[PDB]
Design a protein around this ligand. Structure first.
Ligand SMILES: Nc1ncnc2c1ncn2[C@@H]1O[C@H](COP(=O)(O)OP(=O)(O)OP(=O)(O)O)[C@@H](O)[C@H]1O
Ligand SMILES: Nc1ncnc2c1ncn2[C@@H]1O[C@H](COP(=O)(O)OP(=O)(O)OP(=O)(O)O)[C@@H](O)[C@H]1O
Ligand SMILES: [Mn+2]
Ligand SMILES: [Mn+2]
Ligand SMILES: [Mn+2]
Ligand SMILES: [Mn+2]
Ligand SMILES: [Zn+2]
Ligand SMILES: [Zn+2]
Lengths: 356, 337
DNA sequence: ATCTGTACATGTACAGAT
DNA sequence: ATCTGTACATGTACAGAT
DNA sequence: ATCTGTACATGTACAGAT
DNA sequence: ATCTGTACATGTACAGAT
């Protein structure tokens, strides 16, 4: 009852969805078209909608959309970047529209993301129907973000991705541990899907950065979010309804509200809570451990789990086990302790940040 | 005990599987070579008990579709039968006559089988009522192969199936929609009549049969759904072996009955291996109810009654009920031979 | 005359709305 | 409960290119 | 267009642990 | 008797090379 009314707050409205989806699809269509025209290096690029809005876990308002422009790159080998698991150099044996981005065998991420961005910037200029601009480039972002004033503000991340259809890299062998939850045939099929590489695009000044790519599994996460039960009928019209997505929404909201207020929490992002809950879904595979009548227990055990990840400084990538999103090298212990105390406070005081 | 012991008997042996399959693959590989003639573009889809892992006793009967992609055919229902259709609009020299198409198809097989000199393999006399060209093979052991000619249509499933495949509370709506996006097939049966085939859909179900995704997987629990199919298949095989009065029954009847039971009883825990006996017994009970009411509807085509008087005589159904009721109430003597 | 990328046409799970 | 807009998977048509 | 290569599902088999 | 783990065998989906 307490949290059922928070979810009612977080529920998107069909009117806002229509209006936001109407505009967003128009801009994305045009951008996809221009990509195909002339002698564009990105001809052949294909579209994949990913992220919260397409998983039906986008909360509060349909105001941020993530879409991937994926380019199939054949004949490709990969140099893992310093045993980090998630970052790679892309190389080419053979000797190609991507020639202008080559740097002798190795493919440049920033060169390719700059040209990409240039094309988007230009194509946005020729849009007089709607109020749309390109956000200033952010470090670490593989995206070209559109800022739309549809009266209301709307972000769109155009994510540039390489597509490889070969078997996933060995750093993911022990990843995606869904055998006791979605099972082994689901895991095999998912791992027959392509894998994706997005530009790391850091500006830390370290070697290789600028030619460093990062693995992406947004497509697999989209599948998992919309096929999340041990029973095939979970949340279907002739099935029982679980509270897995509702729990993700509340956790997302906790982090969003806190992040709006305290900039100490800049290190953190919603992908953290997304990863923590994929683990909880593996830990607690049965649909009967996400009964909507136990919403509070379920939300509380997800918080308990997240608290332990913050304290023990460990939150493994769901797809790349050896990569720790809560490593010291990524977030201070101070930043983690600060969030740990803020979560315990909300936890033991009636969640007053939900009423803001 | 009894039933575990019987299941041990019916279990195929790795060695016999290895021997039969390599010989069977040789003939199908060679036959499918030849076909791509008017059947160029024919693709091989393996079907039936052996490929569903419910073949019992011996690997001695294999089923194969040679399906043919055929575009924008008009379909027309046969006097409201449900499952039989006339087909209208390379294959020009055949309304598409199933009889005609089958015969040339047959002619090719026959011709090519005559060229095989490394395997003892002949073509069985044509059986009226069979859409199959059947091969009889001798390794030192007898093995028969059904080469099934199918048309493949990539459009919506016909209207008579709209209420079919009632898997919604079992395998669910997403599975049902994806299955119905697969193509549907048409198979020869009056001379130009074809029949719908869903062997491809039945193969997926047999191998994705649980309400939980992990059913019968390495990180899941075993159910006894396939063992019940095997036991019921065995009971009918042994009865037909002995009673010519049961000539009109076939294993597909048993298969159809258990699909209904799997829909009636969707939860994996209703098919617990610790409950093999009751599960078997309630399958027997359901099958007798089908006999008693003369009603066993095609799982994909609900109006089509496989147990109508028109196809199986009232006498034959009561004869099979008497014999099953007997074996049921006597501890299955027939399982002992 | 044919071929074929692009995009209309069809159907339905999901979840908001009445 | 039923009605219903969006997203998305797959089947097909046809303008414009061959 | 056709075929090999790869991965892992579905089986059977058999011994050592329960 | 049943269960676990390893070995052994076939089927099948699809990347990619020719
Ligand atoms: N740090 C990251 N590492 C790996 N994948 C990430 C990371 N950040 C985002 N992604 C992927 O990109 C998608 C879009 O990210 P985004 O930050 O918009 O979050 P979201 O999941 O869409 O939710 P919301 O935008 O409502 O916070 C994520 O769903 C995830 O699949
Ligand atoms: N009357 C029928 N109607 C529809 N499909 C049928 C019919 N008879 C057989 N089939 C299809 O052809 C397949 C092969 O049939 P067949 O007679 O070989 O039985 P089976 O299921 O393979 O089992 P087994 O040979 O072990 O008894 C079946 O599995 C089914 O898909
Ligand atoms: Mn998002
Ligand atoms: Mn984003
Ligand atoms: Mn068979
Ligand atoms: Mn057969
Ligand atoms: Zn659910
Ligand atoms: Zn099972």
């Amino acid at each position: 009852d307490k949290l059922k009314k928070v979810l009612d707050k977080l529920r998107l409205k069909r009117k806002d969805i229509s209006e936001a989806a109407e505009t967003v699809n128009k801009v994305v269509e045009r951008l996809l078209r221009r990509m195909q025209k002339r002698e564009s290096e990105f001809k052949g690029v294909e579209q994949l909608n990913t992220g919260s809005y397409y998983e039906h876990v986008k909360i509060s308002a349909p105001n941020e959309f993530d879409v991937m422009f994926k380019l199939e790159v054949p004949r490709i080998e990969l140099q893992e970047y310093y045993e980090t698991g998630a970052f790679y150099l892309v190389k080419f044996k053979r000797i190609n529209p991507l020639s202008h981005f080559l740097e002798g065998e190795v493919l440049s991420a920033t060169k390719m993301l700059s040209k990409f961005r240039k094309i988007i910037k230009e194509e946005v200029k020729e849009i007089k129907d709607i109020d749309v601009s390109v956000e200033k480039e952010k470090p670490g972002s593989p995206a070209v973000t559109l800022l739309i004033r549809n009266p209301e503000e709307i972000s769109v991340d155009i994510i540039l991705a390489l597509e490889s259809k070969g078997s996933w890299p060995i750093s993911t062998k022990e990843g995606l541990p869904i055998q006791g939850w979605l099972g082994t045939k689901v895991r095999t099929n998912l791992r027959r899907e392509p894998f994706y590489l997005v530009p790391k695009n850091a500006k830390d000044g370290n070697s290789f950065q600028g030619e460093t790519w990062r693995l992406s599994f947004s497509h697999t996460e989209k599948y998992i979010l919309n096929n999340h039960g041990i029973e095939k009928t979970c949340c279907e019209s002739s099935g029982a309804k679980c509270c897995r997505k509702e729990c993700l929404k509340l956790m997302k909201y906790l982090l969003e509200q806190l992040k709006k207020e305290f900039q100490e929490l800049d290190a953190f992002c919603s992908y953290h809570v997304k990863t923590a809950i994929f683990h909880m879904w593996t830990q607690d595979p049965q649909d009967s451990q996400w009964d909507p009548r136990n919403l509070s227990s379920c939300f509380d055990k997800l918080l308990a789990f997240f608290l332990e990840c913050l304290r023990t400084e460990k939150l493994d990538h769901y797809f790349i086990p050896k990569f720790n999103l809560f490593s010291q090298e990524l977030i201070d212990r101070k930043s983690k302790e600060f969030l740990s105390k803020k979560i315990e406070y909300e936890r033991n005081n009636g969640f007053p940040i939900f009423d803001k």
